Amino acid sequence: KREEYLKNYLESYLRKKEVSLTEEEFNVILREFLRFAYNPEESGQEIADTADGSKTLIHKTYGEPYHSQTAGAIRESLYKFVRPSRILEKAKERKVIRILDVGFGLGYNLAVALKHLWEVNPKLRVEIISFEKELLKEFPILPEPYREIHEFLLERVPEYEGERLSLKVLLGDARKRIKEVENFKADAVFHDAFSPYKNPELWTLDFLSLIKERIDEKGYWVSYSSSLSVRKSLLTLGFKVGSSREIRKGTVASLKAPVPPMEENEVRKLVLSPFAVPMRDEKLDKEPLEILIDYLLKVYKIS
Numbered sequence: 176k177r178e179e180y181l182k183n184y185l186e187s188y189l190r191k192k193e194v195s196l197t198e199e200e201f202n203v204i205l206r207e208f209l210r211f212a213y214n215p216e217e218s219g220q221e222i223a224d225t226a227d228g229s230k231t232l233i234h235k236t237y238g239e240p241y242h243s244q245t246a247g248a249i250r251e252s253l254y255k256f257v258r259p260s261r262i263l264e265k266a267k268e269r270k271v272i273r274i275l276d277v278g279f280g281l282g283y284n285l286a287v288a289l290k291h292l293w294e295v296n297p298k299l300r301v302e303i304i305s306f307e308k309e310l311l312k313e314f315p316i317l318p319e320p321y322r323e324i325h326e327f328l329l330e331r332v333p334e335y336e337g338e339r340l341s342l343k344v345l346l347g348d349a350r351k352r353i354k355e356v357e358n359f360k361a362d363a364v365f366h367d368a369f370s371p372y373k374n375p376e377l378w379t380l381d382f383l384s385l386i387k388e389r390i391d392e393k394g395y396w397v398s399y400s401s402s403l404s405v406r407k408s409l410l411t412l413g414f415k416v417g418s419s420r421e422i423r424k425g426t427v428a429s430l431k432a433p434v435p436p437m438e439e440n441e442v443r444k445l446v447l448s449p450f451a452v453p454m455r456d457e458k459l460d461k462e463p464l465e466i467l468i469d470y471l472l473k474v475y476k477i478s
């Protein structure tokens with residue numbers, strides 16, 4: 176049972192950590208940990224419908240869709256990650272576009288981007304590096320008009336070099352694999368992990384920093400997420416942080432390019448909230464549950 180496992184885990188971690196808290200403090204951390212954590216006992220994926228008619232899977236461990244059912248998967252790729260990134264604009268002028276892709280998933284963002292990028296300029300050479308700890312063998316295929324392009328990408332996984340296209344999806348943990356990427360400054364980072372409470376390793380200040388080294392200054396970092404913790408971390412690293420919407424808003428970041436701007440209530444929350452904390456993996460070797468626990472401890476000023 177998840178509850179049982181999680182409580183043990185927490186109790187166990189606190190002892191290792193040698194933290195001291197009140198009972199009230201303990202109760203509260205546990206209550207939130209139980210509510211925000213994922214399902215470590217589960218694994219596998221389940222097929223599901225999406226509003227725009229594309230398919231997605233639900234990941235049983237994370238308890239989340241690869242893509243938002245409410246938006247539709249193509250629509251999310253397009254409006255949360257492709258457009259806001261601005262690669263399509265850059266494309267007409269440019270001869271190369273580089274994308275850093277965080278979480279290969281079913282390959283939707285990449286496929287959606289490539290269709291547009293190529294429509295805009297057929298001759299563009301595209302460099303993609305992606306990170307995927309759990310590559311799949313069966314993928315739901317995108318409906319037309321993205322089916323051709325999707326299958327084309329899938330054929331080329333995981334390593335491909337071509338006139339137009341360079342692809343590397345590096346299997347394993349991104350935290351490990353990222354250090355290998357050198358001499359790459361991305362035009363776009365598509366940061367598409369499962370949600371931060373769910374998938375904590377990929378949203379720490381520490382990981383984001385590694386991402387930072389790999390982004391062109393005028394490049395854009397995009398995610399569906401508007402997590403306060405994530406935004407606060409981006410600000411810490413020097414990004415300009417902004418919002419994208421197709422109501423739930425996303426985040427757009429750049430070190431030096433312009434970003435659309437958040438809105439008054441967004442700023443307020445960011446200033447006001449207890450939850451506007453970074454999240455922390457300093458060695459980058461931490462267990463995901465742990466990263467979450469550490470966060471709750473900070474948030475609740477047990478620390």
Ligand SMILES: C[S@@+](CC[C@H](N)C(=O)[O-])C[C@H]1O[C@@H](n2cnc3c(N)ncnc32)[C@H](O)[C@@H]1O
Pocket residue numbers: 240241242277278279280281282283284285306307308309310347348349350367368369374376377
């Ligand atoms: C939101 S999904 C991917 C959706 C995908 N971007 C798409 O466009 O179709 C999250 C992906 O991140 C991967 N992931 C989660 N944690 C990871 C880690 N530490 N390292 C690498 N990949 C991870 C998951 O296995 C999953 O493939």
